[PDB]
């Protein structure tokens, strides 16, 4: 009975398991319950804290993945399967995982908390790309990740109802945050230094915790990778949430109480079977059940809240990958496949824009097409294909991020910004997608440090830099190596200079303006064009 | 005659003329100045189409420039060379329909290709007697036959009550056309070839050339065309019948006045009264907008230039078109608040947004925001230096560069052989501030070969640059191709095409081919904007 792998939290005792990291062992405590299972009549409900348990809870394996849609686009293909559930699906999924150094940290170690993405309809803390052993071993970090309910189970709301209030998936995340405050010290973590980080919907979730007062007392810094609370896909209005809820009730044969009761009696998979059929138009990068502006968790829209918020003692690191948009195109944009080079016609390009900006009037769609056309080569399919990707990435990630960065900087926050431009040598997607949404994660978690994975040696040294930036930021709110001259320095992002850095195999390069002209189009012009139809 | 120079006596359809032997750096030229080509458009003929000049008796002296067409005189900067060089340099008069001819001396052996200059000046000003329009250098150095005419400007040239008999509109254009006919009938007497006539002009001169291309009756009077910094399409060169009627009647009101009775009253007002009120009839505070311009009458212009270029066949047509680097700067100092020739005109963002409302007077609030968003440098949105240059670019792009881009595109796509350039050399002798760069109108002195006059103080490289230009221009007149058939060592100037969109730069360095004439931005103006303000 190894004492290092024994811990006492408020609910009782846990036994973790010693794991092998390339350069040493780490303590891992997997599958810790932080809430009463959200099953039966608890479905759609805010989480309750897990009840105490007798004896020693075996905490040595990953628990169930939250019930969610499973991808079929490219069955067997690693590039998609790597995102699929790698454990059994269950509504009983409210568990977190903790990795520490082995032996346990002598003094209180900064805590990093990972929040996975997946459009708010999928994701699991157990995926290999989120393996915390590397940062724990190498940077001596204490790392936490949780599951939170997705799709209908986490975000289906009948706003104002008692039995489907909305945002329960975010409440799951908040509950795990509180658990970390109350328990992390037992593991050698510092509850007074907690950094959230996440990607895609995970980044947006972090963003929402920034924008929701009750969450604020639970962390000190935030890292948002390729996702924001603001923007087209991350939130919906109370009205539109009510709309999608009842339409789904209808699709499954169903006053709120009555409706919600009948929904609670449907097998999980019946709900998932119609998840995708409540969307108001044909679209990409749009998801059926996501956080809802309820005047509660979110008191106003994210855009309102970031405009008027005070972000004084906040430090935030934000960034995007070189090709945010490409991944989404193969999911139903006519012309795109991972198999051909998806060179497209001008006709397909226009068609793709109606889908990419589902909310756009004819005139607005025209404006997008004109802005993104290369008038020197208005009909070259390589340009058209790339352009289609940029529309999607820019509309949904880059410009929302540029927007957020500016507002936080302007309003007191210390902001650091990056763009990730290195395509992994082991990447299974076609070259034309470049560096897609999701593919910086393996580097930040340090997977290339595992030799059996067959990353080049440069990628290994890269991974080490990234882990150092992230953990430095975690320790100090500044990504820069606190004793190290010349890189040169990573400068803060400010509305004036608008400096950000390029993360790739070459040393840090400071650039100015994150797509400034194009984000002006998306952030400043398009809105006028639509709020005037 | 008897003791007169025998090579300066020439007969034309209306009578005998005596010309003058002028000095040019490389030798003498024959000049015939102030040849009347129309009945004085005075009295009951004001606003009326020109009638051919009635034959005269004896030898008409053609040794000096004639009256300049009655017009507004610039007062912005008294005595300043930069403005004065464009001001009238002869007595103002409604009796002003005269043309000028320059030929080699003695006159050429075989029939020489003919160049015809049409001065610009917003359709409210201009004169063929200005120094920058001196044909003596092209005639001497290139052996060209060069012809320039006066045509009526302002109210006298363009005030229209469309439909009416006494003020049909476009008579200024008709003055121009009559001089073209005059050249057809008479230019052989000077050694000119009526079978080889090239039109060239600048600003409203260029738009004029454009309208002759779009007007059937003019089509048979010339073979090739050059448009410098101007087009028949675009926002300032024409008005609808409705708008011209409106401006015509508003002006009559302003001076104290059934169209017949209205026009009849106007014909009694002194020319100066008309000039003194012509700027007051514009719909909005604006730059690069003129009160009295060609009207779309379903006659001279059968439809809009925009329409006609979109649908006409231009198989048989060669055209050279271009722009200067800084088309807009000149206009900013005429009443965009913040700008002056005496300081750097560094402006504020507020002054930039105010300037945009003025430069795009037709623009709704949304359209003007679009313009400002497109032109703001979002890295330095407050930088007074980018704002000043952006303001100049807005004016230049909207009024010239994008209409010209649009024109070259449509013409090439429909038959024409098109050559395109941007002129980028600031004259060492320029009196305007550096911030203005290469302003509207400042290529002209090079094309006409002024730097060849030793007393002028141009640099030697400029003197050589001028010769290159005169060469491209005359080569195009002769052949429909600017390129020297001999010189293949020198880099070639390729036609402009929808496919490649190639054009050359014109500076002290050798020809450099570039691709895309402000393509992205011109998409904004030519494709997006029109659709926008249909809302
Ligand atoms: C986890 N991640 C890949 C990094 C981020 C998530 C990427 C989201 C991609 C969404 C693609 C839409 C999938 C729609 C399937 C419905 C078929 S009916
Ligand atoms: C002949 N040119 C000067 C080369 C090109 C002509 C361009 C004319 C510029 C027009 C300037 C606006 C003048 C407005 C006068 C206001 C008096 S109330
Ligand atoms: C330049 O001159 C004009 C007129 O005198 C003036 O209105 C403008 O403000 C001046 N610019 C500056 C900033 O000195
Ligand atoms: C050219 O330079 C000479 C020498 O100073 C000067 O006297 C003359 O006036 C100048 N001519 C012009 C046109 O400026």
Residue numbers in the entry:
A (entry chain B): 4 to 257, 265 to 543
B (entry chain A): 1 to 257, 265 to 542
Original authors' sentences:
Another important factor in pest resurgence is lax control measures owing partly to growing concerns about insecticide safety. Such concern may be well founded, since many insecticides phosphorylate or carbamylate indiscriminately a ubiquitous catalytic serine residue at the active site of acetylcholinesterase (AChE, EC 3.1.1.7), a serine hydrolase vital for regulating cholinergic neurotransmission in mammals, birds, fish, and insects. AP-AChE (AgAP-AChE), is present at the entrance to the active site of insect AP-AChEs but not at that of AO-AChEs and AChEs from mammals, birds, and fish. AMTSn have a trimethylammonium group on one end of an alkylene chain to confer affinity through a cation-pi interaction with Trp87 at the active site and a methanethiosulfonate group on the other end to form an adduct preferentially with a free cysteine residue. In this article, we report data confirming that Cys286 of AgAP-AChE or its equivalent in the Ae. aegypti or C. pipiens is targetable by sulfhydryl agents and that AP-AChE contributes most of the measurable AChE activity in An. gambiae s. str., Ae. aegypti, and C. pipiens.
After shortening the AMTS13 exposure to two minutes, however, the mosaicity decreased, permitting acquisition of a dataset with a resolution of 2.6 Å. The AMTS13•rmAChE structure resolved by this approach is generally similar to that of the apo rmAChE, with an alpha carbon root mean square deviation of 0.27 Å for monomer A. In the AMTS13•rmAChE crystal structure, the well-defined electron densities at the bottom of the active-site gorge reveal no sign of a covalent bond between AMTS13 and Ser203. Instead, AMTS13 spans the active-site gorge, with its linker adopting an extended conformation to interact with side chains of Tyr72, Tyr124, Trp286, Phe297, Phe338, and Tyr341, and with its ammonium group engaging in a cation-pi interaction with Trp86. The –SO2CH3 group was undefined as the electron density of the inhibitor is slightly disordered at the opening of the gorge. While this structure does not support the reaction with the catalytic serine residue, it does support the concept underlying our design strategy, namely that the ammonium group of AMTS13 is near Trp86 and its methanethiosulfonate group is located in the acyl-loop region where the insect-specific Cys resides in mosquito AChEs. Moreover, the crystal structure shows that the methanethiosulfonate group is distant from Ser203. Our AMTS13•rmAChE crystal structure supports the initial reversible inhibition. We also found that the strain energy of the most solvent-exposed disulfide bond in mammalian AChE is about 0.6 kcal/mol higher than those of the others in mammalian AChE, according to the density functional theory calculations using the coordinates of the AMTS13•rmAChE crystal structure and the procedure detailed in Section 4.10.
